[PDB]
Design a protein around this nucleic acid. Structure first.
Ligand SMILES: [Co+2]
Ligand SMILES: [Co+2]
Ligand SMILES: [Co+2]
Ligand SMILES: [Co+2]
Ligand SMILES: [Co+2]
Ligand SMILES: [Co+2]
Length: 162
RNA sequence: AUUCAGGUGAUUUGCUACCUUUAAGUGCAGCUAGAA
């Protein structure tokens, strides 16, 4: 899995169909919204999930949760690093998506954080993919709500270029 | 941004483990010290 950004035009397009699709741009944002690198690939779709910074309510999400996967530094639990918001993952088109170029990125603190995140994500990549798969299954079955409408998004997204 | 998914224990509070590919109650705490 890897860090991506997604183009606004694409986000705005999907937002037409489901407003739960994550916000991509904001003046308050110090860096572009980052997503995680192919969390589910099924039925010919590729999903990315948005990362989000710590908020108070996160304290109540249990490891067993399908909506959220909490991030923290390997071996250092008190260093919370936000969470992957699986319930707002979205199918993507490769041309509307773009890997962060960490190699050319200046050595800021944010970069350091990205690397504490990556190491944790990588060590848990399977857990993450498995939660994504079960999340979407439950949503197809009508067993879970308050997530992006995966069927609807899956239905319109390849029409973006039109 | 979008403010805690449901469930597995003849009992089950917290966290955790487990199941959700239809199956699945483990572990640490807490509480208990009972009697065949
Ligand atoms: Co780490
Ligand atoms: Co750890
Ligand atoms: Co639950
Ligand atoms: Co099932
Ligand atoms: Co059924
Ligand atoms: Co178990």
């Amino acid at each position: 899995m890897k860090f991506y950004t997604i183009s606004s035009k694409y986000i705005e397009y999907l937002k037409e169909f489901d407003d739960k699709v994550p916000n991509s741009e904001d003046p308050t944002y110090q860096n572009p919204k980052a997503f995680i690198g192919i969390v589910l690939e099924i039925q010919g779709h590729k999903y990315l999930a948005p990362l989000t910074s710590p908020k108070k309510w996160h304290n109540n999400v249990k490891e067993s949760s399908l909506s959220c996967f909490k991030l923290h530094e390997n071996g250092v639990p008190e260093n919370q690093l936000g969470l992957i918001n699986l319930k707002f993952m979205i199918p993507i088109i490769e041309a509307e998506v773009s890997l962060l170029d960490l190699g050319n990125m200046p050595n800021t603190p944010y970069k350091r954080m990205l690397y504490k995140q990556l190491q944790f994500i990588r060590a848990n990549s399977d857990k993450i993919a498995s939660k994504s798969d079960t999340l979407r299954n439950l949503v197809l079955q009508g067993k879970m709500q308050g997530t992006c409408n995966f069927s609807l998004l899956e239905e319109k997204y390849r029409d973006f270029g039109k």
